[PDB]
Amino acid sequence: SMFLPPPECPVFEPSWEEFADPFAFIHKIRPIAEQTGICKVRPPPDWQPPFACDVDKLHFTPRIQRLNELEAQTRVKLDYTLRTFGEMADAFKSDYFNMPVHMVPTELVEKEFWRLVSTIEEDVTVEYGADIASKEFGSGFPVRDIKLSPEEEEYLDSGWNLNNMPVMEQSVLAHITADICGMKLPWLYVGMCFSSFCWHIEDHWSYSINYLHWGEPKTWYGVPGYAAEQLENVMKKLAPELFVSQPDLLHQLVTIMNPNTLMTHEVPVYRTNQCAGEFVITFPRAYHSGFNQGFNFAEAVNFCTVDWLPLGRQCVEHYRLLHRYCVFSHDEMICKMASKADVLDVVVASTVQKDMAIMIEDEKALRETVRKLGVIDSERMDFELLPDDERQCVKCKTTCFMSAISCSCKPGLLVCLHHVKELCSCPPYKYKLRYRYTLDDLYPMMNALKLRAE
Ligand SMILES: N#CC[C@@H]1C(=O)Nc2ccccc21
Ligand SMILES: [Mn+2]
């Protein structure tokens, strides 16, 4: 009645052997965890990264948040000290409940969150921190710089030190030479009671991993990737305003929604309370939302395994259908990796080769179609040199890389090969196919991957 907690998500307690390599571990739990969307990981008892900071010297700009179910909020776009925020946060919780903050049961905060967001007359606003590491507020994990203690040095190269997750070998966002800071760097999150993250999935359907360094728990709700479309259909019926087209990526709309509402509409939802020292991992296209139980500090990062590559391709297709902007070009990433085939991990090479084959066959068919539309002239074009906003399809906003159509009538404008008719009124013989590679360039690149994969 009123609020029924979703079933608990899977919780894993890996041995040190099982834990050592995060990518091997994630691959192992995937058949289980991808059915629930989120899972929790408790590191071995001895894995204990040192956490030290001067709460008076760390400062950040707070964001402010109203807490109303189904109200549109904008996705976080890229002054308190940690001490003064903590004082505010503790006093808020203490005053809200007239209790000391740790004697407030997590069950009660959860119950009260879902009451207050649903109740029109309640007008609770809270503040929180969200940004990438900076000189003003750095990573909670050890980074190289400051003479480090031996304990700190021990965690510098940990696979679970989230600063490393991008630049590692089984990672794929690693190789992106395009600098997508907002997506590949860890985000730092200072939370307070009820501060909340709305239902969302990660850009390009990536994984994410979140570590709670310190503080009171973080309550999560997650939905498996197989039910993403189900969830969106529920959202569109109850909150249509979230689905209107938007000028760019810095304008995405998201919302708070009771998981019981999703469960009523047959969407599977799981929950967990993430405590200090625990990881939460979200899987590709797994919707998630949640809120903080009190003053805390978390760090999170996106990543992409080899398992994810086919889903990445599907995601960009989905973005095209929605006319949504891309964070990066998937094809550019694939070709960058092929161009480095000799130094790729061999399983990575094998998986990239398979995606590349699909890319090449799709590209071959698209080029045949636009030739039949009367586009005859062509010229090589180094798309990777163009700023992203100078190589988006006028129609579907996809980031071009393999090819595009241009016309001297509309200088600087491009369409992708799905939208040749959307560029201008000139007849197609006035158009040029701009292409990064010939088919004859591409097959050798794919062959290099095959040789590396052996
Ligand atoms: N995804 C996710 C959780 C992460 C967090 O731990 N706090 C916060 C606030 C806004 C957006 C995303 C987050
Ligand atoms: Mn997220």
Ligand code: NA
């Ligand atoms: Na309300």
Ligand SMILES: [Zn+2]
């Ligand atoms: Zn297009």
Ligand SMILES: [Zn+2]
């Ligand atoms: Zn024209």
